[PDB]
Amino acid sequence: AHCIGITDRDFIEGVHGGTWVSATLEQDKCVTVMAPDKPSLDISLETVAIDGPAEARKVCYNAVLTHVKINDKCPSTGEAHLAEENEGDNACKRTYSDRGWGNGCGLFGKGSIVACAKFTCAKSMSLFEVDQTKIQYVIRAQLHVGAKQENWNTDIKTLKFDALSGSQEAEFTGYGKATLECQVQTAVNSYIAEMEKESWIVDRQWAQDLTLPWQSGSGGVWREMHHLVEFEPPHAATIRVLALGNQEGSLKTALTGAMRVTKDTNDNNLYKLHGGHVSCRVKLSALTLKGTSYKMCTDKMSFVKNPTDTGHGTVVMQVKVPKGAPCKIPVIVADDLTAAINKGILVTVNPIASTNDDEVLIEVNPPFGDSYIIVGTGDSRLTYQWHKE
Amino acid sequence: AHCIGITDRDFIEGVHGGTWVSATLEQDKCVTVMAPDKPSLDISLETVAIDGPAEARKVCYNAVLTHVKINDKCPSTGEAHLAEENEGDNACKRTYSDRGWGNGCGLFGKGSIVACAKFTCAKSMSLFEVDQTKIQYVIRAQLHVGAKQENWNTDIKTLKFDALSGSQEAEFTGYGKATLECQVQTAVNSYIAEMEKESWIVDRQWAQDLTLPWQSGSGGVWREMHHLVEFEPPHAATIRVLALGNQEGSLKTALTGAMRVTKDTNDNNLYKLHGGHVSCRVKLSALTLKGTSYKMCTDKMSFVKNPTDTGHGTVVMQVKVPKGAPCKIPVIVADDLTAAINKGILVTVNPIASTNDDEVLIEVNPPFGDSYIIVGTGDSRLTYQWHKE
């Protein structure tokens, strides 16, 4: 029934003697499956997530340079050295400066000069390895029984899947069961990138080709520090060493193209992916209809919710049954008030009210142009003039 | 103007003294860019294709076995051999059969037996290497000038791009030029799969992991033939060797979840993709309006095409200008027939008729509720009552 709440909807129609149907589930899309003498089935792809992905890399986009050491030697006096050159947490550069009288050198020419700086990563981007098998995907399933919207969540059977989890059964008490054989499609060489609270799906080759300092799994060592370090041309005894600007903006700019990932609120290790699609095969032969034996409702009913357009070309209404329960709710969509031929298509197959004062939510597809929605019979019946554009 | 023909449309609005705007171009979607005193610009992603991709592999899904040779030797008489065992075009199997009196062997036990069959691939699937750089993407650009639909294709400037092709200029004679800095997003490693006329974008790892005979680039050798060959348990001197069924169905089934590729009709090497998106930055400051000097149309005009809803919340109409050309077409959307305050938003900025009997197509966004569409002035002006739901 939840497809009504969802903008993008598709109707799968089953042929009378068939047992299986095929459905493609995209995220933020819903599918209503209809089969003759079978209750209509709403199936939708909730989330496609990955739980506990191992961290492959870290990419510093904001670096801080501290304790800059510069050593120099007059021309023809040898190469200048620093102990930091041996220190792994230091980014260094060896070069020469113009020396002579004016900078305390007895000889005019190129004098040795070396600069080292302590590299500290202020802000880095995490890169996670996504295992195809560890991919978990959740599918919501529900029937068109006549439950009020406020109850939808409690009637929705949640089907949990992982890569090759096998067929999942959705058992509805009083309506039998439907079976789902789902396969997640690996169409969506990829890392899970994380910057602060924001997450994306990136290409591995692209991420490795980023001109930025990167750190291996478990860390302890920064490679390619020179990507965030700037050495200006040397003066006689000094070199201006500067940390490059925060590359957060450039990174985000490059990431604008990329698919985004919602990090789970409760769990710091769960990552809900968008974009992915699921190919499902549904067995309906095990589905049945409740209240087939029920006598038709003859008592005065009323519209709790007037017939309203769903935006799906269908109409929903909420009918109250104060008396006569348990009973079948007679619903047709005729050409006029005289004719008794149903021209409409009932999504809520065999609507029933098990108890008195029950409010049954009914969805129906009226024909094009002018028609009349008729609920029940006799003088007490409910009528509502309708027009389909 | 072509966005009108396209279902999914988006309106980009430029701020008065700004020069650049950002647009995201998805396939089967259009974007209308509007800037004050600038002609509205329709931009859309036509095709994202790859030209001349090198063939990496071939995957046989339908094999044919011919000329079956079987050699055998009685127990304790040595191993049985065939010349075909060294022939690369032959799939072979070595095993033993139960031998003794009844099959012409003086000894009861396991006798050597070997079977070879000429392997011929009836039908195979091609796999192409897709170069990120060789990716070409085409963008259609057009202005809202007032051209009839039948002429749209001739007014559309085609902007050809490839990975790092640089900014492309779209020059419209009499309306200046617009500039586009586009970047294709390499979210869509990957092979290009081909079966008969049908093509798809597949994952490399998935394709390599297929339990089927495969051939290298510049082929002449088939590897893993056993995937399509069946050797039945041996009889005394014979083995029933049979080719396995056409795996076309299984392949297509697996391919249902994958992105599809349209092979170009004219070119056998061009492959148009169905999934990528393009991030574009558009410069509009160089765009100008034609007929700013034109005097307003004062002659009796007529509606060739009555104002019609586009489904985009806008209205299109086709106005004939028999006399007065060259002239400005006065168009406003007022509260009534008396008021002269334009409450509507004109998509066709400064509509003009350069020649007599010109039929100008005009699009405008009327305000909500009741309004009046007014074209021209005087007693000969055109009026059309409108309502926005």
Automatic annotation (TrEMBL), chains A, B:
<keyword id="KW-0378">Hydrolase</keyword>
<keyword id="KW-1160">Virus entry into host cell</keyword>
<dbReference type="GO" id="GO:0004386">
    <property type="term" value="F:helicase activity"/>
</dbReference>
<feature type="domain" description="Envelope glycoprotein E central and dimerisation">
    <location>
        <begin position="2"/>
        <end position="291"/>
    </location>
</feature>
<keyword id="KW-1162">Viral penetration into host cytoplasm</keyword>
<keyword id="KW-1048">Host nucleus</keyword>
<keyword id="KW-0261">Viral envelope protein</keyword>
<keyword id="KW-1168">Fusion of virus membrane with host membrane</keyword>
<keyword id="KW-1015">Disulfide bond</keyword>
<dbReference type="GO" id="GO:0005524">
    <property type="term" value="F:ATP binding"/>
</dbReference>
<keyword id="KW-0325">Glycoprotein</keyword>
<dbReference type="GO" id="GO:0019062">
    <property type="term" value="P:virion attachment to host cell"/>
</dbReference>
<dbReference type="GO" id="GO:0019031">
    <property type="term" value="C:viral envelope"/>
</dbReference>
<dbReference type="GO" id="GO:0042025">
    <property type="term" value="C:host cell nucleus"/>
</dbReference>
<feature type="domain" description="Glycoprotein E immunoglobulin-like">
    <location>
        <begin position="293"/>
        <end position="388"/>
    </location>
</feature>
<dbReference type="GO" id="GO:0046983">
    <property type="term" value="F:protein dimerization activity"/>
</dbReference>
<dbReference type="GO" id="GO:0039654">
    <property type="term" value="P:fusion of virus membrane with host endosome membrane"/>
</dbReference>
<keyword id="KW-0472">Membrane</keyword>
<keyword id="KW-1170">Fusion of virus membrane with host endosomal membrane</keyword>
<keyword id="KW-1133">Transmembrane helix</keyword>
<keyword id="KW-1038">Host endoplasmic reticulum</keyword>
<protein>
    <submittedName>
        <fullName>Envelope glycoprotein</fullName>
    </submittedName>
</protein>
<keyword id="KW-0067">ATP-binding</keyword>
<keyword id="KW-0945">Host-virus interaction</keyword>
<keyword id="KW-0946">Virion</keyword>
<keyword id="KW-1161">Viral attachment to host cell</keyword>
<keyword id="KW-0812">Transmembrane</keyword>
<dbReference type="GO" id="GO:0044167">
    <property type="term" value="C:host cell endoplasmic reticulum membrane"/>
</dbReference>
<dbReference type="GO" id="GO:0046718">
    <property type="term" value="P:symbiont entry into host cell"/>
</dbReference>
<dbReference type="GO" id="GO:0055036">
    <property type="term" value="C:virion membrane"/>
</dbReference>
<dbReference type="GO" id="GO:0016787">
    <property type="term" value="F:hydrolase activity"/>
</dbReference>
<keyword id="KW-0547">Nucleotide-binding</keyword>
<keyword id="KW-1043">Host membrane</keyword>
<keyword id="KW-0347">Helicase</keyword>
